[PDB]
Amino acid sequence: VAVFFEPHEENVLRCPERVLRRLLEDAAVTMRGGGWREDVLMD
Amino acid sequence: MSLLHTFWRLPVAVFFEPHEENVLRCPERVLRRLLEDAAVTMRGGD
Amino acid sequence: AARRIPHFYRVRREVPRTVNEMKQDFVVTDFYKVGNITLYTELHPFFDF
Amino acid sequence: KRDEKHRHVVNVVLELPTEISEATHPVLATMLSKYTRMSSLFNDKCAFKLDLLRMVAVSRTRR
Amino acid sequence: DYEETLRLFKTTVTSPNYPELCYLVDVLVHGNVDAFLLIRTFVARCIVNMFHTRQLLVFAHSYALVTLIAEHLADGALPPQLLFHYRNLVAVLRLVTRISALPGLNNGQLAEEPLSAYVNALHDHRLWPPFVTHLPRNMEGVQVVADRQPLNPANIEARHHGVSDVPRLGAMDADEPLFVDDYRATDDEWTLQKVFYLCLMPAMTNNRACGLGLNLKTLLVDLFYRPAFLLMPAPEDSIAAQRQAVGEMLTELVEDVATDAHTPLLQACRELFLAVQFVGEHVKVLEVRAPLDHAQRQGLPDFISRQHVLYNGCCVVTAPKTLIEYSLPVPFHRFYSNPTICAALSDDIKRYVTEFPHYHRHDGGFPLPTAFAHEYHNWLRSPFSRYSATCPNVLHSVMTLAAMLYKISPVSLVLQTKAHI
Amino acid sequence: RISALPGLNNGQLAEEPLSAYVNALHDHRLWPPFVTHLPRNMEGVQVVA
Amino acid sequence: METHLYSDLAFEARFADDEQLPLHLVLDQEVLSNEEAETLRYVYYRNVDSAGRSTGRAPGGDEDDAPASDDAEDAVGGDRAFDRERRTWQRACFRVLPRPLELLDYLRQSGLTVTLEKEQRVRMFYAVFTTLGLRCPDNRLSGAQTLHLRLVWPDGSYRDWEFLARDLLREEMEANDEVARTDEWKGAGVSRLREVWDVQHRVRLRVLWYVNSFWRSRELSYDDHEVELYRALDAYRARIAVEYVLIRAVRDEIYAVLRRDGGALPQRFACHVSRNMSWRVVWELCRHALALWMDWADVRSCIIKALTPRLSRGAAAAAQRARRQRERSAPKPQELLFGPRNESGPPAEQTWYADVVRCVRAQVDLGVEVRAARCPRTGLWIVRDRRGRLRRWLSQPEVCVLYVTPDLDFYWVLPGGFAVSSRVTLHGLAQRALRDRFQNFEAVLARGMHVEAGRQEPETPRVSGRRLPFD
Fold it and tell me: In terms of domain of life, where is this protein from (chain E)?
């Protein structure tokens, strides 16, 4: 038998600072990379 | 140690078949092995 | 495909069975009994479902 | 000139030891005549090595 | 009564100690007639010596090697017994091919296809042998896929072994241009290949076979880059000097296997060396897409069948030990998918098998890679693996496997029924 | 080969495969009388010296 | 056969006004499946010049070149844009031959004298015959023009192919009682047969050149300027990128709102959670799943599939009606006691489309349909399958799912239902690109269907070769 918490509007899943840092660095690298798929098809 | 924040201040005991509701059953080993296998899989596939 | 073979086995997750392979493992007379769950797919000799 | 590029392809790319010189290997010179004509494919030196190997093999076939 | 040869085949194929150089010479000759003719004496002496020291018939793993051995090595260099064993293997192939078709009734053609092809899949060109050396003569409905798209006749470009080809060696890892020898297998030898790989091999090996491919480019530029091979004049000093000249790997490979006293080790190494000029390329896995024959095509018209074959590869029955680090295991078929061989060849497969011991079995239930795992779209399905995994090694088992490929088409049913089969 | 049931034992319900449940010759809990190497797994097996 | 001759006659009749010359096409099992040939309804073609302008839109530029601004009321231009795109598409005459044949033998067996250079037989399991036109505004034809091809099936589904003139006319322009035109047409025959490929190199189709085609005699001029073809290439690049820039906009919106909320993600889908699950692994799995979705997103992603019905003409009137029905005060007692019953409010269930990505093994699913309803006791979302079954992929720890609503609101979901919510910004692109690349086919009346709209579909016509030919 395990205990679980019931969903509701108030609850929230927080983010660690390091994880958010890594996500935003990946987002910036992806935006600056310029490896667009339509560019691959045009190539 | 707190990343989840809950409205309800006291948890309930799980019941009923998995077809009735969505629950997160999650052994630590299962999750860790899943992550460590998935990480390399994304890298595989000018 | 010639070099990505280890990547498939690199993850330690099971691979589900298929209907035909499950159909193979029944004895001749045991095949027709109600315990055979694969009978609902055996609609045609020349075509499998 | 040509000495720099020739020494490049024979030493930095082919990694062949110095004691095997030009006059001691005529098929080597014949291949080097065409090897320098391409400026790319100098990263997988094993390809040039293999071509030199099988051209040496071709030379010593009595047929 | 060809039985004594089949017992020899069973003993040699299931042998753990099957020699290392057999796979290497198989891929070096690549199934090309000229390459075998260049190395004709070496393979004959190796066969004689290996049969003398070990009571087995080597070279049995590759169809091209055994058929060229049976043909060319007949004139000389072999004793009559071994030649008769190889000829008996070819005779078993021919005997079962006679059973495959219906020779009495198949006089005619339908839609410009031979009437025997409609009866049995052995005679159908849309069925490919799992291992390929040369492309077939017929490509009417066969779309061969190399990377994504079907191979236009412009992407297939013949290799010429005599002069240069530096960019071809550089392109070895690449896939899209399918380099081939300028030869095309005829329908008869196509049927023989299909027979050898589908009927004979799993029956004799009990489905314990496997396929592998080599990083041959990196292997040869260190196995043969020794100065002894470069400076070949147009030996006999000492054994140790020969070993130092030739290298540790080749010494391990060849030392006692082809090195009779009438021809020291270095001469055998040079014989193997001249054959390298027919170098081929890296191993590749090809997908075969083909719609069924015009009689089978009445139902499910859009059924494009997916089939997978190995090109520039090898069929092996035991894991190598001196060629481990330069080899890749490629289980692709539901035959040739032994978990043990590929587990010994690669660490990741070994860990996957040790995690899931129930996959260690050999009844065709081993999980093929998701790319190859299309059972329904294949011509051969689970019952073939299940039957072959426990069948006896009698020749009748081979002919039973051949009989199971009789087709379901209405014309095939007519031809079977008129013969009262 | 004869000890197990090769045509039916394709499955799993623990760390132990189905072959462990059908024959004691496969499962790791029955050690051989003479041993030099300790086996791969000892989940529910303990050695007392 | 008869379609090509009739199309030659018809294009000859109308060349005075339209100035389109006919191009005869035959297609085989490489472009369409046997089912699609057996069930083909309409074949359509559209011409795009070297400037990227469709034949049927104003030459100097149109208001469709202006961008659209995300509002459902003026939904990507309303019905007028649909009418314009209807006007630009032209319909051809086509025939279906379902039995296997080879064109050389079939034409020799017909009255036409083929005269090809070599007697190489070309076999095909089924043949669909069609003839398309390409417009030259004057006696000059350009090699940078591109022609689009569409095949339409009774379910409203369609596929798009486009190829440019210089492949269609690579060598053709360099090769330069009373008689019925049918007689000399058959007696003159055909001699040149070439293979043409789509720009993406995805479809192979054959073109036939009948020597007695009327377009021969006009002594028309042809040329292909290099800058003109460069313009055609860059315009094609602009056309092909619509779905990918939309997906990138979704990516940037996801990252922007993930930055804005400080990484704290509130729950929007109802699922039970545990305080003692390791959520760091969940976060890293979310990162990997997001990267994989960025990689494998396709033209059939949920965002484009949801954008597609927004462009239909019914959307604008439906948006007006829905907004007016929401724009209501409390109802007066008079209307409650007397008169008609109240207008039915929006339903408690909705139809959604979603993209599901898996991290355990490389696998995504894109054209997934899901039904959405709100759980009354908690006010959160519950995802149900099309048959009514509950979707369990929310519980599965290896899965992240992106949902898109009909009103272009999208939810990004990691395990536990904790979600990231933002609106789609279709502001980035001109109305012309969205309206040209994706739009639902609107049926025009033909044989075997009721004239009264909305009636039950009769048996699909299904011209077939497995039966004896019907007459």
Answer: Viruses
Q: Which of B3, B11, B12 sits opposite A13 (nearest CB)?
A: B3
Cβ atoms of residues E322 and E220 within 8 Å:
no
Report the 10 Å Cβ neighbour count for E56.
18
Q: Which residues contact G132 (CB under 8 A, 6 or more apart)?
A: G22, G23, G25, G45, G92, G147, G149
Q: Where are the beta strands (DSSP E) in G165-203?
A: 190-197
Torsion G406-G407-G410-G416 (CA) sign: negative
Between CA G455 and CA G447 the distance in angstroms is 15
With beta carbons less than 8 A apart as the criterion, state whether G382 and G270 touch.
Answer: yes
At residue E137, what is the residue type? R
- Measured between beta carbons, the chain C residues lying within 8 angstroms of G361 are 11, 13
Interchain pair A13, B5: CB under 8 A: yes
Strands E109-110 and E113-114: antiparallel
User: Taking an 8 Å Cβ-Cβ cutoff, which residues of chain A contact chain B?
Assistant: 1-6, 8-16, 43
Which bin fits D60, alpha (ψ -120 to 50), beta or left (φ > 0)?
alpha
* Contact check, Cβ <8 Å, B6/A4: no
Cα–Cα distance for residue pair E275/E42, rounded to 1 Å: 10
Tell me the C-alpha distance between G276 and E318, whole Å: 49
- Decide the pairing of beta strands A3-4 and B12-13: antiparallel
Q: What are phi and psi of E232, to 5 degrees?
A: -90, 115
Chains F and C touch (3+ CB pairs under 8 A): yes
Contacts of E164 (CB under 8 A, 6+ apart): D34, D51, D55
Tell me how close the Cα of F10 comes to any Cα of chain E, in angstroms. 6
Do the chains contact at C25 and F8, CB–CB below 8 Å?
yes
Contact indicator for G433, G62 with CB cutoff of 8 Å = no
Q: How far apart are CA E79 and CA E67, in angstroms?
A: 17
- The length of chain B is 46
Q: Does E have 3 or more CB contacts under 8 Å with A?
A: no
Instruction: Identify the residue whose tokens are 């998935």.
Output: B38
Residues paired with G230 in a beta bridge: none
Distance of CA E320 to the CA centre of its chain: 16
Token pair listed for A10: 């108030």
Would you call C14 and F10 a contact, using CB atoms and an 8 Å cutoff? no
- Residues in chain E closer than 8 A to C6 (CB atoms): 346-349
d(CA E116, CA E187) in angstroms, rounded, equals 12
For residue G56 the two structure tokens come to 């049927």
End-to-end CA distance of chain C: 28
Q: Which structure tokens are listed for G187?
A: 């007696």
Q: Does G272 touch chain A (CB under 8 A)?
A: yes
Side-chain-side CA neighbours of residue E336 (13 Å):
28
Taking the Cβ of residue G73 and every Cβ of chain B, the question of whether any pair is shorter than 8 Å is answered with no
**DSSP string covering E187-208, please?**
HHHHHHHHIIIIIIHHHHHTT-
Longest dimension (CA), chain B: 56
Resolution (A): 4.0
Cβ neighbours of G270 in A, within 8 Å: 7
CA-atom Rg of chain D in angstroms: 12
Contact partners for chain D, using 3 or more CB pairs closer than 8 A, are E
Rg of the Cα trace of chain C?
16
Q: In this structure, are residues G155 and G139 in contact, taking their beta carbons and an 8 Å threshold?
A: no
Q: Do G123 and E302 touch (CB under 8 A)?
A: no
Question: What is the rounded distance in angstroms from the CA atom of residue E396 to the CA atom of residue G17?
Answer: 77
The shortest C-alpha distance from F25 to chain C (Å) reads: 23
- Count H helices, E strands: chain E? 19, 13
Structure tokens at C13: 């997750």
> Which residue numbers of B have CB closer than 8 Å to A's CBs?
2-8, 11-14, 23-25, 46
Query: Which pair of tokens denotes residue G216?
Result: 């021969």
